[PDB]
Amino acid sequence: AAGGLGVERFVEIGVKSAPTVAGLATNTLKLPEYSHSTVEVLNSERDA
Amino acid sequence: AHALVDRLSAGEPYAVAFGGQGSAWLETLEELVSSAGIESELATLAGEAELLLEPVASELVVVRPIGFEPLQWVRALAAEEPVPSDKQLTSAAVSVPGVLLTQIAAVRALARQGMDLTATPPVAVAGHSQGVLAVQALAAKGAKDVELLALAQLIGAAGTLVARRRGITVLGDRPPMVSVTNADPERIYELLEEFSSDVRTVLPPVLSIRNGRRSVVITGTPEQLSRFELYCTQIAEKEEAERKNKLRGGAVFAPVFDPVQVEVGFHTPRLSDGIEIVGRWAETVGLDVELAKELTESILVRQVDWVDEITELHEAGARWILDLGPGDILTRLTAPVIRGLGIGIVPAATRGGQRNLFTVGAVPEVARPWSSYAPTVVKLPDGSVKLETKFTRLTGRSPILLAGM
Amino acid sequence: IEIRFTLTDVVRSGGAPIVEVDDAATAMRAVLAIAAGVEGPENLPKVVDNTATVTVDWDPERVADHTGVTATFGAPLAPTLTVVPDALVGRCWPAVFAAIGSAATEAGFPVIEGLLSLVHLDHAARLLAELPKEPAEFTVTAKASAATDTEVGRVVPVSVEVRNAADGALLATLEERFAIRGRTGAAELTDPVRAGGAISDNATDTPRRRRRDVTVGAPVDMRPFAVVSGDHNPIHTDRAAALLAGLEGPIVHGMWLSAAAQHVVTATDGKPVPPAKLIGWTARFLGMVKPGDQVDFRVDRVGIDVGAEVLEVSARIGSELVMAATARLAAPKTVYAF
């Protein structure tokens, strides 16, 4: 926000551990982050 | 034989209104040319548009080439093939002058048939946004006509150079101009002030137009406006959980939010660097009149408190208001504002409302003065006092009843 | 400004009743020199000697005009940067042209160049890892790497170095190659041969991925771009000069197209964040373009260089190929969590 809000990509690594903190981020991207931002949640396991 | 004008002379008074930007002007200008059988004015207006740009000693280096010959675009548009995109035509540089020309041509149309009658007399002439321009020289002599178009050419030009849209997204879609409905002017400014607390001095949103009681317009940078859009949505949703508890003080608000098609911020500090430049642009031309400085500030920076102005000329007891603005804008904005206070309003260049104008019998549209239905006192043979209403008059009794219980 | 010419008639040869003055080439130059530079910019290099651009400042309104000259919306495109790398060409233009003729052109070439016959081959901007920014001032240097002749004519590749004034470092490198069609030389000889590439140390390979289908209109008149870019060539403006050069009409500036297709690649595969993403772009002009032109562009994702995605662009007006473009783009910025 202080450095500009433009497109961000959030990638989790460690293979099968990847869905967790992304799902943690996903639900977090929902509740406070409702501002309608373009964000990409990517997982090493799932989204390779 | 125009009854209204004939009314205007002996009977009820009149006021001229001019619309602003966001009027969808081109299609009105295209029709106005096609509906015009008299091209006489357009000959001089086109030549003076060419002339006035050349002697200009003001900077105006970028503006003059990006200006376009009005006669060519019209004849092209009349061949039905050529015309630039709406995005190009809506840009302040070529749009602002074009809007005035539509309004000026709208003045001439009525002036063609009835001029001896359709000559001067308003009580006052008022305008909205850039509409205040065409107001001034209409109240001045006829040689000042292009000066409007001349200043309009300068207004949209500097405004464009200083600040222009750098981005847009199909969702909403997001402009510099935003409007919220149903919410108080105090409540809107609250959320505005709530959001403006979080942003820098360079891109604050501000209240531009107050269109009515609960209807307002806030403007600024498209991105920052989109941020204000977020808070109003969250409150709308949190209050939804309230309404479904079936409680009134605990009820959701049902506002209406949605952006506008306007391309650039007006009546905002973002145009502040434009005022100076515009001012010099007028003095280097034969446009010199002392209101060029005041018009610019009113249009570019100072807000427009609208309801209060046209109402002020209305509370003077002037019964009629016409609007020569493109399509027709501000003619209908003003109507529910005043409504039943005795004012009524015909859109000018609208064929239906002009049919009134040109006839002896179709003229007197005067909206109902609610005070007309104000209750009165009645006496009877046995000498009973009766309070008179539309109810009592029928029933012959007091305007009060015990409902079925 | 006026242009004069002279003829001479010897009728002893009937097949050659008219033979016209050999001073034409030098006479044409004096005419262009008055119009082009007006002695406004002045440095006096020979073609090999460096051509210097004194000082250059970027106003916020010069940002707007260019970004407004080329715009894209219908495809969800949002241009963002302080200075688009396309804006480099406006700064380096007046200097590059000065190298088109010289004593080295006098030695090995006839010095026969029609300016109307000038053809732009390729244009590219290579970054030194620095990107252009707000108010800091620029100073540009232009050098001619080689002067070549081809079967189709004379070619002059021009190297350009853009430097930030206040900081005093070289931000970017701009490359231009021009084609005059009438000349031959002992300087640099090419038949069909010229080649350029955007290369990087570490690379990854990918598969063809369709990104966007683009619709781009050409401007109504070419004068607006002519004012900003500083290209006054009558070919794109005056119809008499365009017809004299045997052209389809007042051809759209290839340079406008260059920024036209770029602005899309800027915003599309670049996404709402173009500024730090595109580190380079190259553009090849396949065919001429008339104003009022509906052109369809298509960018695809091909491969990866130095962690930056490469993006190939093809252009079609109906059946005709127009521009071949290729760009190096950084990926949408990634944040990692373990």
Helices (H) and strands (E) in chain B, counts: 17, 10
- The H or E element containing residue C95 is helix C88-96
Resolution stated for this PDB structure, in Å: 17.5
CA atoms of C218 and B225, how far apart (whole Å): 32
How far CA A20 is from CA of B146, B298, C108, in Å, comes to 68, 57, 71
Q: Cβ separation of C217 and B169 shorter than 8 Å?
A: no
What is the SS3 assignment for B194? helix
- Number of Cβ within 10 Å of residue B167's Cβ equals 17
CA distance B218 to B189: 9
Do B287 and B64 contact (CB within 8 A), yes or no? no
What is the residue-wise DSSP string for B361-382?
SS-------GGGG--EEEE-TT
Q: Name which of B271, B233, B266 is nearest B252 in CA terms.
A: B233
* Residues 6 or more apart in contact with residue B283 via CB below 8 angstroms: B58, B292
B65 vs C contacts (CB less than 8 Å): 223-224, 227
Q: Which residues contact C273 (CB under 8 A, 6 or more apart)?
A: A6, A7, C80, C332, C333
C-alpha distances (whole Å) from B263 to each of B24, B80, B257, B296, C215 are 12, 25, 18, 18, 21
Indicate the helix (H) or strand (E) that contains C35. helix C24-36
Residue C148 is inside which H or E element, if any?
strand C148-149
Identity of the amino acid at C258: S
Say how far apart CA B333 and CA B210 lie, in whole Å.
11
Local structure of residue B252 (DSSP, 8 states): P
Q: Which helix or strand (DSSP H or E) is residue A9 part of?
A: strand A8-12
Contact B117, B5 (CB under 8 A): yes
- Amino acid at residue number C107: A
Cβ atoms of C132 and C172 closer than 8 Å: yes
Nearest CA-CA distance, residue A9 and chain C, Å? 4
Interface touch A10/C334, C-beta < 8 Å: yes
Pairing outcome for strands C148-149 and C188-189: parallel
Residues in C closer than 8 angstroms to A25, CB to CB, are 337
Distances (CA, A) of B250 to A1, B187, B234, B237, C290: 34, 17, 16, 13, 64
Burial C240-264 (b: 16+ CB within 10 A, else e): ebbeebebeebbbbbbbbbbbbbbb
Q: How far is the C-alpha of B382 from the C-alpha of C251, rounded, in Å?
A: 98
CA distances to B139, B360, C274, C313 from C266, rounded to whole Å, are 50, 64, 5, 12
Element spanning C337, H or E: strand C334-337
Q: Exposure string (b/e) for C52-61, b if CB count within 10 Å is 16 or more?
A: ebeebebeeb
Q: Cβ of B387: how many Cβ atoms within 10 Å?
A: 14
Among B350, B352, B345, CA closest to B322: B345
Per-residue CA distances from C322 to B103, C193, C296, C325 (Å)? 44, 21, 9, 10
B307 phi/psi in degrees, rounded to 5: -45, -45
Instruction: Tell if the CB–CB gap between C271 and A21 is shorter than 8 Å.
Output: no
Edge-to-edge strand list for the sheet holding B206-210: B206-210, B216-219, B177-181, B256-259
B161 touches chain C (CB under 8 A): yes
Alpha-carbon distance B230 to nearest alpha carbon in chain A (angstroms): 5
Q: In chain C, which residues have their Cβ closer than 8 Å to the Cβ of A18?
A: none
Chain A positions in Cβ-Cβ contact with residue B234 (cut-off 8 Å): 34
Phi, psi of C5 (to 5 degrees): -140, 165
The size of the B-C interface in CB pairs under 8 A is 32
Local structure of residue B304 (DSSP, 8 states): B
Question: How many C-beta atoms lie closer than 10 Å to residue B378's C-beta?
Answer: 13
* Cα gap B362→B356, rounded to integer Å: 5
Rounded to whole angstroms, how far apart are CA atoms B346 and B366? 10
Q: Round to whole Å and give the CA distance between B260 and B247.
A: 33
- In chain A, DSSP finds a helix count (H) and a strand count (E) of 1, 2
For residue C332, give the nearest of A7, A14, A25 by CB distance.
A7
Contacts of B166 (CB under 8 A, 6+ apart): C64, C67, C79, C80
Residue type at B69 in one-letter notation: E
Alpha-carbon distance of B203 to B44, in angstroms, equals 42
Structure tokens at C189: 């000889």
Say if B76 is an interface residue toward chain C (CB within 8 Å): no
**Chains with ≥3 CB–CB distances under 8 Å to B:** A, C
Residue C271 touches chain A, beta carbons under 8 Å: yes
Find, in chain A, the residue whose alpha carbon is nearest to that of C336.
Answer: A11
User: Do the strands C278-285 and C320-330 form a parallel or antiparallel pair, or are they unpaired?
Assistant: antiparallel
The neighbour count for residue B398, using CB atoms within 10 Å, is 13
Token pair for B207: 């209240």
- Residues of chain C with Cβ-Cβ distance to A12 below 8 Å are 336-338
Distance of CA C165 to the CA centre of its chain: 23
B102 within 8 A of B74, measured Cβ to Cβ: no
Query: B223: part of which helix (H) or strand (E)?
Result: helix B222-243
Both structure tokens of C120: 């732009």
The token pair that represents B117 in the structure block: 């009658």
Query: What gap in Å lies between CA B198 and CA A5, rounded to an integer?
Result: 14
Give the angle subtended at the CA of B128 by the CAs of B303 and B178, to the nearest 5°: 55
Tokens of C4: 């004069």
